[PDB]
Each structure stands twice: as C-alpha cells, then as structure tokens.
Short mmCIF file of C-alpha atoms and ligand atoms in Angstrom, two decimals:
data_model
loop_
_atom_site.label_atom_id
_atom_site.label_comp_id
_atom_site.label_asym_id
_atom_site.label_seq_id
_atom_site.Cartn_x
_atom_site.Cartn_y
_atom_site.Cartn_z
CA UNK A 2 11.22 11.17 27.23
CA UNK A 3 8.17 12.01 29.27
CA UNK A 4 6.83 9.41 31.70
CA UNK A 5 3.53 7.83 30.60
CA UNK A 6 1.72 9.84 33.22
CA UNK A 7 3.28 13.08 31.91
CA UNK A 8 2.19 12.14 28.38
CA UNK A 9 -1.26 11.50 29.65
CA UNK A 10 -1.33 15.09 31.11
CA UNK A 11 -0.93 16.43 27.71
CA UNK A 12 -4.69 15.72 27.34
CA UNK A 13 -5.77 17.96 30.27
CA UNK A 14 -8.64 20.35 29.15
CA UNK A 15 -12.21 20.50 28.17
CA UNK A 16 -12.87 18.43 25.04
CA UNK A 17 -16.23 19.15 23.31
CA UNK A 18 -17.73 17.41 20.36
CA UNK A 19 -19.50 14.07 19.87
CA UNK A 20 -19.35 10.28 20.06
CA UNK A 21 -20.57 8.85 16.70
CA UNK A 22 -21.27 5.20 15.98
CA UNK A 23 -20.78 4.08 12.38
CA UNK A 24 -21.46 0.82 10.61
CA UNK A 25 -18.57 -1.10 9.00
CA UNK A 26 -19.58 0.47 5.69
CA UNK A 27 -19.36 4.03 7.06
CA UNK A 28 -22.99 4.81 7.73
CA UNK A 29 -23.66 7.11 10.65
CA UNK A 30 -25.97 5.23 13.04
CA UNK A 31 -25.95 7.20 16.25
CA UNK A 32 -24.33 10.44 17.42
CA UNK A 33 -24.37 12.07 20.86
CA UNK A 34 -22.96 15.49 21.78
CA UNK A 35 -20.27 15.33 24.41
CA UNK A 36 -18.20 17.41 26.88
CA UNK A 37 -15.20 15.59 28.39
CA UNK A 38 -13.37 17.41 31.15
CA UNK A 39 -9.96 16.13 32.20
CA UNK A 40 -8.66 18.04 35.17
CA UNK A 41 -5.56 17.51 37.27
CA UNK A 42 -5.75 17.59 41.10
CA UNK A 43 -3.25 17.46 43.83
CA UNK A 44 -0.26 18.71 41.80
CA UNK A 45 -1.50 16.60 38.89
CA UNK A 46 -1.13 13.38 40.89
CA UNK A 47 -4.84 12.57 40.26
CA UNK A 48 -6.76 13.19 37.04
CA UNK A 49 -10.54 13.59 37.29
CA UNK A 50 -12.53 12.77 34.16
CA UNK A 51 -16.08 14.24 33.78
CA UNK A 52 -17.83 12.94 30.66
CA UNK A 53 -21.19 14.52 29.87
CA UNK A 54 -23.21 13.30 26.85
CA UNK A 55 -26.58 14.57 25.68
CA UNK A 56 -29.46 12.55 27.16
CA UNK A 57 -27.15 10.49 29.39
CA UNK A 58 -26.03 10.59 33.08
CA UNK A 59 -22.55 12.08 33.64
CA UNK A 60 -19.66 9.62 34.00
CA UNK A 61 -17.00 10.65 36.57
CA UNK A 62 -13.75 8.69 36.95
CA UNK A 63 -10.48 9.38 38.70
CA UNK A 64 -7.11 8.04 37.73
CA UNK A 65 -3.87 7.91 39.82
CA UNK A 66 -1.87 5.93 37.19
CA UNK A 67 -1.88 4.79 33.60
CA UNK A 68 -0.94 1.34 32.50
CA UNK A 69 -2.69 -1.80 31.57
CA UNK A 70 -4.02 -1.48 28.08
CA UNK A 71 -2.97 2.12 27.56
CA UNK A 72 0.11 3.63 25.93
CA UNK A 73 0.89 7.28 25.25
CA UNK A 74 3.01 9.30 22.96
CA UNK A 75 4.68 12.48 24.12
CA UNK A 76 2.09 14.71 22.45
CA UNK A 77 -0.71 13.03 24.37
CA UNK A 78 -1.82 10.81 21.58
CA UNK A 79 -2.64 7.22 22.77
CA UNK A 80 -4.24 3.92 22.27
CA UNK A 81 -6.52 1.87 24.54
CA UNK A 82 -7.61 -1.72 24.28
CA UNK A 83 -7.07 -5.18 25.54
CA UNK A 84 -3.81 -6.64 26.57
CA UNK A 85 -4.62 -10.39 25.82
CA UNK A 86 -7.00 -11.72 23.21
CA UNK A 87 -8.72 -15.09 23.34
CA UNK A 88 -12.00 -17.06 23.10
CA UNK A 89 -14.24 -14.40 24.78
CA UNK A 90 -12.11 -11.42 24.28
CA UNK A 91 -13.05 -9.80 21.00
CA UNK A 92 -10.66 -7.78 18.88
CA UNK A 93 -10.96 -3.97 18.90
CA UNK A 94 -9.60 -0.96 20.71
CA UNK A 95 -9.06 2.82 20.27
CA UNK A 96 -6.55 4.95 18.44
CA UNK A 97 -6.64 8.48 19.70
CA UNK A 98 -4.80 11.35 17.93
CA UNK A 99 -4.08 14.62 19.50
CA UNK A 100 -3.21 17.71 17.32
CA UNK A 101 -3.31 21.33 18.55
CA UNK A 102 -7.02 22.11 19.48
CA UNK A 103 -8.33 18.73 18.32
CA UNK A 104 -8.52 15.12 19.16
CA UNK A 105 -9.69 12.43 16.83
CA UNK A 106 -10.34 9.17 18.48
CA UNK A 107 -11.40 6.04 16.60
CA UNK A 108 -12.69 2.84 18.16
CA UNK A 109 -13.01 -0.39 16.30
CA UNK A 110 -15.27 -3.19 17.49
CA UNK A 111 -15.17 -6.83 16.23
CA UNK A 112 -17.69 -9.57 16.70
CA UNK A 113 -17.29 -13.08 17.90
CA UNK A 114 -16.48 -14.33 14.39
CA UNK A 115 -13.65 -11.92 14.17
CA UNK A 116 -15.38 -9.50 11.74
CA UNK A 117 -15.65 -5.68 12.05
CA UNK A 118 -19.03 -4.85 13.70
CA UNK A 119 -18.83 -1.16 14.20
CA UNK A 120 -16.82 1.88 14.80
CA UNK A 121 -16.98 4.91 17.08
CA UNK A 122 -15.55 8.19 15.90
CA UNK A 123 -14.98 10.69 18.56
CA UNK A 124 -14.29 14.26 17.18
CA UNK A 125 -13.29 16.66 19.89
CA UNK A 126 -12.21 20.32 19.92
CA UNK A 127 -11.01 22.32 22.93
CA UNK A 128 -13.86 24.30 24.46
CA UNK A 129 -13.76 27.83 22.98
CA UNK A 130 -11.79 26.78 19.92
CA UNK A 131 -13.11 26.15 16.39
CA UNK A 132 -14.75 22.78 15.59
CA UNK A 133 -12.28 22.59 12.78
CA UNK A 134 -13.90 19.72 11.10
CA UNK A 135 -11.85 18.17 8.26
CA UNK A 136 -13.60 16.98 4.98
CA UNK A 137 -15.00 13.56 4.54
CA UNK A 138 -12.00 11.46 3.46
CA UNK A 139 -11.83 10.63 -0.31
CA UNK A 140 -9.40 8.29 -2.16
CA UNK A 141 -8.36 11.29 -4.23
CA UNK A 142 -7.12 13.00 -1.01
CA UNK A 143 -4.61 10.24 -0.57
CA UNK A 144 -3.25 9.65 -4.12
CA UNK A 145 0.42 10.49 -4.54
CA UNK A 146 3.41 9.99 -2.27
CA UNK A 147 3.93 10.51 1.47
CA UNK A 148 7.15 10.42 3.39
CA UNK A 149 7.80 10.58 7.15
CA UNK A 150 8.90 8.88 10.37
CA UNK A 151 7.28 6.35 12.76
CA UNK A 152 7.87 5.95 16.52
CA UNK A 153 7.16 2.49 18.03
CA UNK A 154 6.74 2.28 21.74
CA UNK A 155 6.44 -0.90 23.91
CA UNK A 156 4.53 -2.14 26.84
CA UNK A 157 7.71 -2.89 28.84
CA UNK A 158 8.58 0.66 28.16
CA UNK A 159 11.98 -0.46 26.73
CA UNK A 160 13.37 2.38 24.55
CA UNK A 161 11.37 3.52 21.49
CA UNK A 162 12.29 2.61 17.99
CA UNK A 163 12.30 5.12 15.14
CA UNK A 164 11.72 4.19 11.46
CA UNK A 165 11.41 5.89 8.06
CA UNK A 166 8.16 5.55 6.21
CA UNK A 167 7.08 5.89 2.60
CA UNK A 168 3.49 5.49 1.36
CA UNK A 169 2.69 5.58 -2.40
CA UNK A 170 -0.90 5.38 -3.60
CA UNK A 171 -1.92 5.41 -7.17
CA UNK A 172 -4.82 4.33 -9.38
CA UNK A 173 -3.90 1.74 -12.02
CA UNK A 174 -5.65 1.55 -15.28
CA UNK A 175 -7.94 -0.84 -14.34
CA UNK A 176 -9.11 1.76 -11.77
CA UNK A 177 -7.75 -0.40 -8.93
CA UNK A 178 -5.71 1.06 -6.25
CA UNK A 179 -1.92 0.34 -5.97
CA UNK A 180 -0.46 0.93 -2.52
CA UNK A 181 3.26 0.61 -1.61
CA UNK A 182 4.10 1.10 1.97
CA UNK A 183 7.59 1.13 3.48
CA UNK A 184 8.21 0.85 7.07
CA UNK A 185 11.88 0.73 8.07
CA UNK A 186 13.37 -2.20 6.11
CA UNK A 187 9.89 -3.61 5.12
CA UNK A 188 8.06 -2.77 2.00
CA UNK A 189 4.60 -4.14 1.03
CA UNK A 190 3.08 -3.39 -2.37
CA UNK A 191 -0.51 -4.61 -3.00
CA UNK A 192 -3.42 -3.87 -5.33
CA UNK A 193 -6.79 -3.16 -3.96
CA UNK A 194 -10.39 -2.75 -5.29
CA UNK A 195 -12.47 0.39 -4.37
CA UNK A 196 -16.13 0.04 -3.60
CA UNK A 197 -17.54 3.40 -2.39
CA UNK A 198 -16.03 4.33 0.95
CA UNK A 199 -14.25 0.83 1.24
CA UNK A 200 -10.95 -0.20 -0.22
CA UNK A 201 -10.56 -3.93 -0.20
CA UNK A 202 -7.13 -5.72 -0.04
CA UNK A 203 -7.76 -9.48 -0.26
CA UNK A 204 -5.09 -10.95 -2.54
CA UNK A 205 -1.89 -10.86 -0.49
CA UNK A 206 -1.46 -12.81 2.74
CA UNK A 207 0.52 -9.83 4.09
CA UNK A 208 -2.38 -7.43 3.51
CA UNK A 209 -5.89 -8.86 4.28
CA UNK A 210 -7.71 -5.67 5.16
CA UNK A 211 -10.53 -3.29 4.41
CA UNK A 212 -9.89 0.42 4.61
CA UNK A 213 -12.90 2.56 5.41
CA UNK A 214 -12.87 6.21 4.63
CA UNK A 215 -14.62 8.41 7.19
CA UNK A 216 -15.52 11.91 8.22
CA UNK A 217 -12.91 14.39 9.55
CA UNK A 218 -10.22 13.02 7.33
CA UNK A 219 -10.32 9.69 9.28
CA UNK A 220 -9.71 6.22 8.04
CA UNK A 221 -9.95 2.85 9.69
CA UNK A 222 -8.00 -0.29 8.50
CA UNK A 223 -9.46 -3.54 9.66
CA UNK A 224 -8.51 -7.20 9.41
CA UNK A 225 -10.91 -8.99 7.05
CA UNK A 226 -11.15 -11.64 9.70
CA UNK A 227 -9.47 -12.11 12.97
CA UNK A 228 -7.81 -15.59 12.73
CA UNK A 229 -6.31 -17.78 15.45
CA UNK A 230 -2.48 -17.78 15.56
CA UNK A 231 -2.01 -14.76 13.38
CA UNK A 232 -0.61 -11.40 14.42
CA UNK A 233 -3.20 -8.67 14.46
CA UNK A 234 -2.94 -4.84 13.79
CA UNK A 235 -5.60 -2.30 14.58
CA UNK A 236 -4.92 0.77 12.41
CA UNK A 237 -6.42 4.22 11.94
CA UNK A 238 -5.32 7.29 10.09
CA UNK A 239 -6.11 11.01 10.12
CA UNK A 240 -5.53 13.47 7.28
CA UNK A 241 -4.87 16.44 9.52
CA UNK A 242 -4.18 18.80 6.64
CA UNK A 243 -4.11 18.24 2.88
CA UNK A 244 -0.34 17.48 3.13
CA UNK A 245 -0.16 16.04 6.64
CA UNK A 246 -1.34 12.60 7.78
CA UNK A 247 -0.82 10.47 10.82
CA UNK A 248 -1.40 6.77 11.07
CA UNK A 249 -1.58 4.72 14.30
CA UNK A 250 -1.07 0.95 14.65
CA UNK A 251 -1.71 -1.11 17.78
CA UNK A 252 0.12 -4.40 17.28
CA UNK A 253 -0.55 -7.89 18.68
CA UNK A 254 1.59 -11.02 18.33
CA UNK A 255 0.26 -14.36 17.08
CA UNK A 256 -0.35 -15.39 20.72
CA UNK A 257 -2.85 -12.56 20.93
CA UNK A 258 -0.64 -10.47 23.31
CA UNK A 259 -0.46 -6.77 22.75
CA UNK A 260 3.14 -5.86 22.06
CA UNK A 261 3.47 -2.31 20.75
CA UNK A 262 1.99 0.90 19.40
CA UNK A 263 3.21 2.92 16.50
CA UNK A 264 2.60 6.49 15.43
CA UNK A 265 3.55 7.56 11.83
CA UNK A 266 3.58 11.18 10.84
CA UNK A 267 4.00 11.76 7.07
CA UNK A 268 3.83 14.62 4.62
CA UNK A 269 2.69 14.71 0.97
CA UNK A 270 5.53 14.84 -1.53
CL1 LIG B 301 -2.62 21.52 42.49
CL1 LIG B 302 -6.25 3.57 8.27
#
C-alpha cells in the first residue's frame, strides 16, 4: 500500500511522555520525561525530529528517506535495529506500536554473551491528549484465547504476507503456564514456569525465551541466549485494551541477517 516514507509520515506530531530504562527483571532504573516533535517540511519531503528530554540537550535530526534497519506498517508502527549481526554487533532493536493518540516503543538490549541486559520503554501520547496509561501487565490479563491476523513485511519490499493467528494461554494444575500459538500453518505449544514478572520457556528447542511483563500493558519476549547459527526473533507485545493485543516480531535468519517484520493484531475470544 503506502510507500515506506508515507508510512513513516503517519508518525508526524508531538509525542510527549518518557524514556524509561528497565532491568531484565522489570525493575525501573531510570526515567526521563520527553517531548519528541516530528514535523514535515518541504511538502513532507524532509522530516525534522526534535527530541527534548529533561536534564539533557535537545537532539535535532532530519531525514529525507527511510531504509536501512527500519521497516514500517501502514499505521506508522515500525521497528528499528541492526541489519547484520556478528562478533561485535550485539542483538537488540526497537518495536514501536502506534495506536490512536499513543505510541508504545520497546527497546531490547543484549550483552556480548548474548543475554538480555536491559530494556527501554518509551510511552508516548500526543500533546494535548490523555496520558492513557494502561495497567501493569499481569498473567491474568492474558489467560484465555486470542484470535487475529498477522502481516509480515520484508526488507526487499516484496509483497506482504498475511496469516491467521491463534494464541491460547492457560494455567495448568501445577500452576505452570501452557501456551499454544498458531501462526499460519505453524503451531507451537509449550509449558512455562512463572516467577514474578517473568515467564520462562526453557524446555522446547522451538521456544527458548523469557517473557517479561511490563507497565502500560507491555511485554518483552527475549531469547534466553543469542546463539551462533540460530535464527533470532525480537518480540514485544502491547495489551492495548482488555480484549485487544498487538505483538511485533523482528526476524533474523541463522546467518544473522534481518529478513522480516511481523505485526499481529488479535482479539480476546
Ligand atoms: Cl510544506
Ligand atoms: Cl512479548
């Protein structure tokens, strides 16, 4: 549909909120209030970015194109990160959801040993609109069944693919979490243990991840360890309303090349 530039322009406006650094266990370490102005110039052929943060100098950037490590969906949602991973290029990147007057942008940061080191949660509302903070995410907010659709877009900008999704999450008896996720023709069903704000999947070679539950209905799903010659998936989620959730997945092949980005929108059944 829209060109990538036109998708990017969906973000124009004044986004107020904060940039918040969390530990890999979900502890708030540092938060700084922010105002990010994205304005179009010269018939929207240039975008000027003015990022003001409390106690910091302004950052001003101007863009005449998007590409590289960025891909956008038609509603302006996007992901940013590295194109090619390797010895000095740590895993990480940003998943950025746009919805009405809000953005929720989640950055994951991995260390040199391939372990999650920190996250940044950027919760933004349009200037003059409500803060509209969602509740801290709880397991109980997710239990049940979810159904929806996913769009996968590609770096070569070959045509998008569309898939059906199902997500079922239930406690077993036991008190462990059972999660069954369908994505097109693929279903993966795995049990997890819950330890506070972290859900741990460590049994199945197809699901070696920690899920961290965060403020504003956010979640981050992280590889337990970034391994050589394995494909990698950076994932975040946002429970936008009690019965509406999006998930975003930035996908890397086992050569460490970024290949695609997927946005799932699902509703509670
Ligand atoms: Cl103009
Ligand atoms: Cl997630």
